[PDB]
Design a protein around this nucleic acid. Structure first.
Lengths: 48, 79, 51, 50
DNA sequence: CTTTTTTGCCTAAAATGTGATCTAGATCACATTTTTCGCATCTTTTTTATGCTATAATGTGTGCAGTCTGACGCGGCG
DNA sequence: CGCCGCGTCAGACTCGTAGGATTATAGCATAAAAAAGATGCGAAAAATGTGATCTAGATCACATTTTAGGCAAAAAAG
């Protein structure tokens, strides 16, 4: 939703310097989502 | 009414008028989703346009009046 | 897959969806016409003969 | 042959011809003169442009 | 009257329940060594812009069209 | 005025079929610019390591309590 590319430290100051608990939250989001909850609508794009 | 577009021109007076106003009306029905008046009978919107024009219900005048009144009331209720 | 519903739907849509008709030379105005569809089990358009 | 929608030209962005390359059917302009004599401005628009 | 089948007892016996009291587990926000990555050097390495070669040499055609044609313009053409 | 020469420029429409090109034409040497690596700089960031915080089951000799059915005799049926 932007022309931007934000990935790192700037985020650290806007929100929270923490960086690799963000990675743990990546694992979280996969678990929230991947386990068949919303996978089915992705899998129609798996053939892409 | 299906194979024959005859009565619609002795009502109005023109092929061009009936075609235009019908495309208008059944565009407000195809994508707008307003209801019919004469029964439906499982046929695409074209027939219902022709039929509604054939009995003396819809015309460019009456379309103008309906859209006028609803839009004026819309401007009113907005304030 | 060719589901039967494909064809059920297709008959459903094709209803009242008029169509054009062209031979060449379209010399005068009546060298093309516009008819209603009807479907057939073949690769051969039929038409009303008199025209 | 039938042609729904596919390739187009390059300079002119226009549909092609030939069943071998999924060819659209041209209309001569006298087919246009027909609806001149009928007056189908919107079909005219359609087949001109889109 | 004899049998067998049942229950209750004998007699031995496993399963149930006291909870009080720890103790190895897992958390938990933040500093350090590794991946091997990206742009500047070299540094070659190939490739590329440019430069000469001193007997002597002097006017094309070059391969074709098969010539449509009727009317009208327009420059001549008198 | 009334020719004459000459040139210009139009030649019904929507589909299908095949792939397809050729001649000859100088040579060496220099110095420059740009392409593939190494190196290296070991940097930014995933792993690793801080120690104090917490916690749900785990235990053994008790007290019932079921199981547990082995026998034999009391009771019911043949």
């Amino acid at each position: 939703d932007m022309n931007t590319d934000y990935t790192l430290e700037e985020v650290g100051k806007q929100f929270d310097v923490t960086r690799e608990r963000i990675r743990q939250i990546e694992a979280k989001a996969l678990r929230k989502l991947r386990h068949p909850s919303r996978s089915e609508v992705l899998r129609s794009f798996l053939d892409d | 009414a299906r194979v024959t577009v005859q009565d619609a021109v002795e009502k109005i007076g023109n092929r061009f008028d009936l075609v235009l106003v019908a495309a208008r009306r059944a565009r407000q029905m195809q994508v707008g989703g307003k209801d019919p008046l004469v029964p439906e009978e499982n046929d695409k919107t074209t027939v219902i346009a022709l039929r509604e024009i054939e009995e003396g219900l819809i015309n460019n005048q009456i379309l103008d009046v309906r859209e006028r009144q609803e839009q004026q009331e819309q401007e009113a209720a907005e304030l | 897959r060719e589901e039967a519903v494909v064809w059920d739907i297709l008959d459903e849509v094709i209803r009242e969806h008029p169509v054009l008709l062209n031979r060449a030379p379209t010399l005068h105005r009546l060298g093309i016409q516009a008819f209603e569809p009807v479907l057939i089990e073949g690769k051969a358009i039929q038409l009303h003969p008199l025209v | 042959h039938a042609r729904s929608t596919g390739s187009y030209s390059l300079v002119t962005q226009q549909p092609l011809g030939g069943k071998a390359q999924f060819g659209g059917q041209r209309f001569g302009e006298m087919e246009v003169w027909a609806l001149e004599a009928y007056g189908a401005a919107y079909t005219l628009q359609e087949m001109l442009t889109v």
